[PDB]
Amino acid sequence: MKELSTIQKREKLNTVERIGSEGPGGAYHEYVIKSNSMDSQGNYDVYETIKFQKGARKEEKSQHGVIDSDLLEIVRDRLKSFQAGPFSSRENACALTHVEEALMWMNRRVEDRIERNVLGTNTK
């Protein structure tokens, strides 16, 4: 089974699973999010596949997809919206600031790799 062990343990809406095998860097590049609930006719309320960029965006060889910062930017935008709205919380603000600091560190990774001419290459 390829079920992710998550920090949340109670009242989970969905489970997440690794899909396929290990790829470049030792990571997976496909995930499925699927609901802990079934519809009236016995099917998943949610069954959602996320495919990540696998290989350089410049080869046609590559599995072209999303990058982790895209997912974090989506979460960042939603948390900002929630904080502007009626159901804001301190827990949200702490989550949002850590999300933004993670994105800034991912951008650090992009910029030092640009400086070293190694972005888009399989090099440490």
Added chain:
Amino acid sequence: KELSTIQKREKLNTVERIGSEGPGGAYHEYVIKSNSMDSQGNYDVYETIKFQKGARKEEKSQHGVIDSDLLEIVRDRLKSFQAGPFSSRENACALTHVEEALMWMNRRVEDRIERNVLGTNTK
């Protein structure tokens, strides 16, 4: 509708809001589309992500993903990259920040359980 992102250079994809504001004032559908293009003018990447919109117990809701799911995926990938040959301190700081975000997201869920407001449209 296009997201202004923290990354400014060498961006692979663009992210856009889909639809209108919903419960809590947020959007519940997003599109990620590649900045690169194929021969016929079709995006090389065009993926929609739909979020839970309305309570999961209600059959009329838009059932979908929740943000901690996406953060757990990113967490798992960062752990795999740190165990692999292309690890970095930048990766490690990002991973710890993602994990602390997930910890605060769980604190929210648990607080809302404590106050008997989880799954309700209330602060």
Added chain:
Amino acid sequence: MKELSTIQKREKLNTVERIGSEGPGGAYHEYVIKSNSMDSQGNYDVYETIKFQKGARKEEKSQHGVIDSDLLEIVRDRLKSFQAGPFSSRENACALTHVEEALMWMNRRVEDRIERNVLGTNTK
């Protein structure tokens, strides 16, 4: 020596001191907090002893006691109360957020150890 070198250096109310010997894990399991002041009769204004859990809560020869998360939860509650009251501060708020993040990491440790089924055993 058994007197703790603390982060605070001036206007300390109390001193903290280790009691006994190193135990499981290389740590001490009993501490005393004693006042830096003495009463009219020449006695400590404060002399408090804290005994930690030492060995498995299941087996009877263990020294049964408190755990560190209990102490941080007390401090978290008091800081929350102070922030609601009239003598709140930014310094309090930073302290409380770090206390809660420490508690969340202690719970990460507990949840990692339940998942590995090592909780309550002398296993790294």
Added chain:
Amino acid sequence: MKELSTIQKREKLNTVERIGSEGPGGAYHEYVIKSNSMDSQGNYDVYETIKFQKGARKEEKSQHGVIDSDLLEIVRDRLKSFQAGPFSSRENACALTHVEEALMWMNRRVEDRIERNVLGTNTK
């Protein structure tokens, strides 16, 4: 109920309770930590009271007691010892750095209050 809602939800050794009434600053100044487990004799295996300084130390009719930085310094010492011993973890390290940064902010509070000549007085 005076029982504290804690961060950890599963496998709790002990329960923590506030004791007394709201005091200076809106906080409680006594807490009890009691075991979730039982002897054969019918009593709690753990039942420990922690009384905090309530009112200034110089005033003779105050409830002299511990302060929160004492408790976090104990936890800091134990965490350092665990990290130097055989059962270390990244979760311990993250908790320890947060505990030390909380102690650093508590000291900032003390030092700021000395600056403003309000340490030991009921004022912001």
Added chain:
Amino acid sequence: MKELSTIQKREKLNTVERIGSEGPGGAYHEYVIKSNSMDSQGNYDVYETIKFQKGARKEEKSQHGVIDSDLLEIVRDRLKSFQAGPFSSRENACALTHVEEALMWMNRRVEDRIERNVLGTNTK
């Protein structure tokens, strides 16, 4: 006085003073660092002024000078060097990561202000 109350309280090499009057945004734009020790001559061993950009750089009547990210980038370079050398420490590491995160947030400000077309203007 115009002397800064600093985090460091003991064994301080220098004092810092703000110079001039409060300017745009409510801040001071000139500072002096001077040694706590004097030479045989009687004058300070260190007396260093730092002027900050006051007014937009495009306007020639402005006081052109340094900006805060310059100073933090100097400190970041020095901490990186110390860590690569013989006298490294965990305290240095925590300081460096915080300096770098402060720089990332200063950059976030600049980029936000570019986004809103307010960079180099006297507005929030």
Added chain:
Amino acid sequence: MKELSTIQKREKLNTVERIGSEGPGGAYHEYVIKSNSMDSQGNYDVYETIKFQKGARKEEKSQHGVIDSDLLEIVRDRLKSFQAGPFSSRENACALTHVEEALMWMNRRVEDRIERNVLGTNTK
């Protein structure tokens, strides 16, 4: 080259350069901040030199100068002022809290070295 590679890439007011050679502990002890702009006469609008303490302050052939805490205290004071003024921001607040945590870690280093009697000596 001796150019500092900075976290900010866009709309930079100034460049920062190392001057001289590596010194004690592996770090540079002199830095120039110079404008990315020039006046009506082809001369830098800005050209500060910052010289750091190099060698123990209490010996006399040492180069006496500033220390990194001095620069962060300046930045801390300015950020506090900007946050009290009309052009405050969340980005400023995050930068300021990181600056202050950096300073408290610098002070941790100083007090640790005092306690070990290594402050002012070339020793790890």
